[PDB]
Amino acid sequence: RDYGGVGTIALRASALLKAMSYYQTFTRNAVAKLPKLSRRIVDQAIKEMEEDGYQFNKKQVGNVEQYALTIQNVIDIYAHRKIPKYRDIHKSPYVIFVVNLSTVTLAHALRVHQDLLRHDLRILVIDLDPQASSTMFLGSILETAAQAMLNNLDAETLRKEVIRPTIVPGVDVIPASIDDGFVASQWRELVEEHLPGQNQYEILRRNIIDRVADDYDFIFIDTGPHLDPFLLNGLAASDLLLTPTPPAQVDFHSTLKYLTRLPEMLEQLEEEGVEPRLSASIGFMSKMTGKRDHETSHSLAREVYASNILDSSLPEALKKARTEAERFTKAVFDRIEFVRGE
Amino acid sequence: RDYGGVGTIALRASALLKAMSYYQTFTRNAVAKLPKLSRRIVDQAIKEMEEDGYQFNKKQVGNVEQYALTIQNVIDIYAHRKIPKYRDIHKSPYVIFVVNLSTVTLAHALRVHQDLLRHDLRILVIDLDPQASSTMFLGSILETAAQAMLNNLDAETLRKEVIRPTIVPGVDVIPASIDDGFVASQWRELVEEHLPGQNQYEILRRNIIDRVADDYDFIFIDTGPHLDPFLLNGLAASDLLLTPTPPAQVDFHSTLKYLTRLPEMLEQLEEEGVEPRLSASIGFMSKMTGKRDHETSHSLAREVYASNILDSSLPEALKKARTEAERFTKAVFDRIEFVRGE
Numbered sequence: 001r002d003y004g005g006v007g008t009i010a011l012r013a014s015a016l017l018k019a020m021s022y023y024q025t026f027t028r029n030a031v032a033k034l035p036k037l038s039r040r041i042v043d044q045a046i047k048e049m050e051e052d053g054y055q056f057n058k059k060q061v062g063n064v065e066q067y068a069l070t071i072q073n074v075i076d077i078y079a080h081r082k083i084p085k086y087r088d089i090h091k092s093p094y095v096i097f098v099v100n101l102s103t104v105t106l107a108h109a110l111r112v113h114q115d116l117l118r119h120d121l122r123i124l125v126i127d128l129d130p131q132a133s134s135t136m137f138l139g140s141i142l143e144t145a146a147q148a149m150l151n152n153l154d155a156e157t158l159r160k161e162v163i164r165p166t167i168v169p170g171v172d173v174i175p176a177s178i179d180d181g182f183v184a185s186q187w188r189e190l191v192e193e194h195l196p197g198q199n200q201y202e203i204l205r206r207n208i209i210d211r212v213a214d215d216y217d218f219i220f221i222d223t224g225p226h227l228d229p230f231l232l233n234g235l236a237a238s239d240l241l242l243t244p245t246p247p248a249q250v251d252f253h254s255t256l257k258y259l260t261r262l263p264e265m266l267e268q269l270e271e272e273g274v275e276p277r278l279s280a281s282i283g284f285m286s287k288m289t290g291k292r293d294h295e296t297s298h299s300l301a302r303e304v305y306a307s308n309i310l311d312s313s314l315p316e317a318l319k320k321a322r323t324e325a326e327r328f329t330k331a332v333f334d335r336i337e338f339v340r341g342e
Numbered sequence: 343r344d345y346g347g348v349g350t351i352a353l354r355a356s357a358l359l360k361a362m363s364y365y366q367t368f369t370r371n372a373v374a375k376l377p378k379l380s381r382r383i384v385d386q387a388i389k390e391m392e393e394d395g396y397q398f399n400k401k402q403v404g405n406v407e408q409y410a411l412t413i414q415n416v417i418d419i420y421a422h423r424k425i426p427k428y429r430d431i432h433k434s435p436y437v438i439f440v441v442n443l444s445t446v447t448l449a450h451a452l453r454v455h456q457d458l459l460r461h462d463l464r465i466l467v468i469d470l471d472p473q474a475s476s477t478m479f480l481g482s483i484l485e486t487a488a489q490a491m492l493n494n495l496d497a498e499t500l501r502k503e504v505i506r507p508t509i510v511p512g513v514d515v516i517p518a519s520i521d522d523g524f525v526a527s528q529w530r531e532l533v534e535e536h537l538p539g540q541n542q543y544e545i546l547r548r549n550i551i552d553r554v555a556d557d558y559d560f561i562f563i564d565t566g567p568h569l570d571p572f573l574l575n576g577l578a579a580s581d582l583l584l585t586p587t588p589p590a591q592v593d594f595h596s597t598l599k600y601l602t603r604l605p606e607m608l609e610q611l612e613e614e615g616v617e618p619r620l621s622a623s624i625g626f627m628s629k630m631t632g633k634r635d636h637e638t639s640h641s642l643a644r645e646v647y648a649s650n651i652l653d654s655s656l657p658e659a660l661k662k663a664r665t666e667a668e669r670f671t672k673a674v675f676d677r678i679e680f681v682r683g684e
Contacts, residue, residue: 001621005650006583007605009623012646014602020595101520130568136592178443178596181568182603226472226523226569241348250478253362254520260356261524263349279343281351304354308347 021140022167024112025057025068034074035115036083045077071112071169078118086119086217090340093213095277096220097238100129101251101258103222104137104166104173109329110218111170116333124163124216126174126208128223128230130181138166138173146180146230149203150194155211163212174208176222180230187229200229201274205237218336225258235265236274240336241281244314245301247288252297259304280339282332284310310335363482364509366454367399367410376416377457378425387419413454413511420460428461428559432682435555437619438562439580442471443593443600445564446479446508446515451671452560453512458675466505466558468516468550470565470572472523480508480515488522488572491545492536497553505554516550518564522572529571542571543616547579560678567600577607578616582678583623586656587643589630594639601646622681624674626652652677 028046032039046056046067056073059066069077079085107123110116126145127134135141143162153162163172183190191200198206209219220242221234235241241262245255269276283305288298302309312331315324370388374381388398388409398415401408411419421427449465452458468487469476477483485504495504505514525532533542540548551561562584563576577583583604587597611618625647630640644651654673657666 002583002623002650003608003618003620006608006620006623008648009585009625009646009650010602010605012648013598016642016645017595017598017602020598140595178567178599182606184568185570224566224568225520226526226566228527241344243351253359253482256355256359256362257520260352260359263352264524266345266348276345278345278348281344281348283351300358303358304351306350306354308344308351 022169023070025059025070026074028067028069031069031074031077035118036078036081041081042077045080049077049080071117074117075120079120083118086121090217093209093216094218094240094336094340095209095238096218096240096242096336097234097278098220098222099241099243099255099258100133100222101225101246101255102133103220104134104171106329106332107171107218107220108166108168109325110333111168113329113333114326115330119217121170122215122217123171124174124212124219125171126204126219126221127176128180128204128221128227128234129176130178130184130224130227130230132176132178134173134222135175135177138164138175141175141177143175144177144180144183145174145208146176146183148174149207149233150183150190152195152207153211158208158212159215172216181227184227184229199272199274201232201236201269201272204233205277209237232265232269235262235278236269236276239277239279240339241278242332243281243283243305244286245283245297245305246286247291247294247297249293249297252300256304281305281308282310282335282339283308284332285313287315288313364511365412367401367412368416370409370411373411373416373419377460378420378423383423384419387422391419391422413459416459417462421462425460428463432559435551435558436560436582436678436682437551437580438560438582438584438678439576439620440562440564441583441585441597441600442475442564443567443588443597444475445562446476446513448671448674449513449560449562450508450510451667452675453510455671455675456668457672461559463512464557464559465513466516466554466561467513468546468561468563469518470522470546470563470569470576471518472520472526472566472569472572474518474520476515476564477517477519480506480517483517483519485517486519486522486525487516487550488518488525490516491549491575492525492532494537494549495553500550500554501557514558523569526569526571541614541616543574543578543611543614546575547619551579574607574611577604577620578611578618581619581621582681583620584674585623585625585647586628587625587639587647588628589633589636589639591635591639594642598646623647623650624652624677624681625650626674627655629657630655 028042031037032042057068057070059068104125107125111121111123125134128145148162163174166173188200191198221238223230223234266276285298285301288294310331312328314328315321370384373379374384399410399412401410446467449467453463453465467476470487490504505516508515530542533540563580565572565576608618627640627643630636652673654670656670657663
């Protein structure tokens with residue numbers, strides 16, 4: 001009956017669908033407390049910089065004029081002080097495959113961090129998760145990552161049309177949709193149509209990542225579990241596996257179950273003729289509390305991840321959480337730099 | 343590098359994996375307030391019933407003896423009163439495909455409901471969702487639904503080994519795993535191996551559902567989106583589509599996007615030679631609040647679902663929520679009965 005009655009709901013829906021279609025400033029003294037800077041450097045940087053244009057941001061507090069430099073003002077002072085940016089040390093595109101069994105939150109943190117601003121970090125968060133969890137950070141969108149890969153777009157198109165800005169200017173995001181799930185269920189088939197002779201597991205690196213390579217210092221990748229064409233494409237273009245491990249006694253079991261399954265994944269990429277770039281890995285507990293079991297699955301974490309485990313775990317709601325999260329970011333950031341070398 | 347360094351984590355994990363492997367009573371007066379009963383019926387039912395065995399539950403409160411009948415005591419009184427059970431009106435297995443873009447909570451509600459106890463409802467919740475969201479309701483398990491389908495098990499095996507009990511005796515659950523996601527990614531392939539000549543989209547109805555048919559009044563099915571072999575098998579064995587619609591202005595868009603995609607799904611089942619049983623549908627808002635937009639996407643709900651929409655939406659934490667949820671259950675239960683007819 002309603003089998004012929006679901007098409008109705010369908011149509012009603014589709015029809016209805018048609019008709020459907022940030023400010024952190026610092027005080028001088030604050031900027032002075034930042035790395036490689038002091039009240040003498042700042043006061044001199046500002047003086048010199050205004051001596052030939054450039055306008056710093058100022059508050060109207062009290063009655064008088066203030067001085068509330070923005071993340072850009074600070075970055076520009078570091079630039080005037082000729083302090084190399086992250087894009088001056090590393091060749092471009094460090095791709096981080098995030099093992100989510102949030103991501104934009106790390107991107108946002110890394111960006112505005114205290115002792116990281118000197119890096120003028122450029123972060124991209126490509127959302128390949130059907131649920132679009134991340135997508136909820138930046139009207140209605142149109143170009144999902146799954147779609148962009150199939151449309152053989154050009155550098156410019158991804159730039160001024162596909163990539164979307166967020167609440168944090170330095171961090172950009174390529175949105176996902178609930179539609180992409182369907183796209184996956186027919187991935188190979190579509191690749192054979194839209195991307196003749198193309199390797200279904202190298203599209204991500206060729207049609208998006210390599211096309212925006214000279215634009216981002218870091219590029220994160222988000223995907224659900226089960227998914228394969230997306231998961232496979234993700235693993236196939238990333239050089240660092242970032243595995244956040246849950247504290248939950250039960251979630252601890254799952255993540256392990258999941259980990260013990262990567263070899264097979266990485267193998268399929270071998271039979272399809274692709275050669276994973278994966279070359280580093282980071283693991284860590286999430287909000288691990290002062291509870292036996294949760295502190296017990298933590299001790300078991302160091303096991304598997306061995307040396308590859310973090311030395312800090314990502315976490316009363318305010319100064320009690322923020323100070324703890326910041327150190328987590330710094331922790332993740334330093335691992336990359338270390339690993340990036342030897 | 344760590345591509346050959348992920349296998350290590352893998353092994354450490356796998357290894358570590360190896361070493362890894364309710365009480366509601368009623369007062370007489372309460373039972374009297376129940377449908378088709380009164381203080382005269384109860385007092386007479388109990389007298390008569392004890393006259394020849396049977397022991398009702400009693401509390402030690404005050405100092406004296408009480409009378410706290412259990413869900414079974416009440417059901418047995420309704421049975422003594424020769425009031426037909428749900429399994430006496432309907433032939434067996436009403437399969438409900440739940441559209442989750444919880445389920446056990448409905449099963450639990452329907453079971454212990456006030457005016458539904460007279461039904462002695464037998465509910466099964468087959469978890470085909472890779473995340474095992476539901477699974478978190480009933481040591482470590484072993485037989486997931488995806489696995490049970492592939493093992494061509496027998497009625498008895500599913501009964502005393504695969505089906506797992508929960509905190510509510512009448513409601514049973516067939517667990518899921520994070521492993522099943524992998525199982526899906528290779529579904530057809532495996533069906534060709536383990537189930538020669540079998541139709542990949544009719545396994546659920548043949549290897550589990552039809553094998554436990556004379557044991558459950560209701561059988562719910564849980565699955566994530568993207569998934570196909572599981573989604574397809576679900577739709578292919580269910581006779582009622584239960585679509586709960588989220589209040590969230592954005593989630594409202596998704597559910598519609600999803601709805602407008604069922605025709606295609608139901609079509610694949612046609613090309614594979616299967617004939618969906620889907621014949622009814624129910625839709626409703628979830629916790630819809632007193633907010634414009636959330637009350638606005640509600641008005642738009644009645645549109646699509648048309649007559650098929652509920653007349654009550656599923657929802658200060660206590661008596662303010664419970665009384666509201668109960669009526670929701672009753673609402674869902676009556677729709678089934680209505681629809682079950684004409």
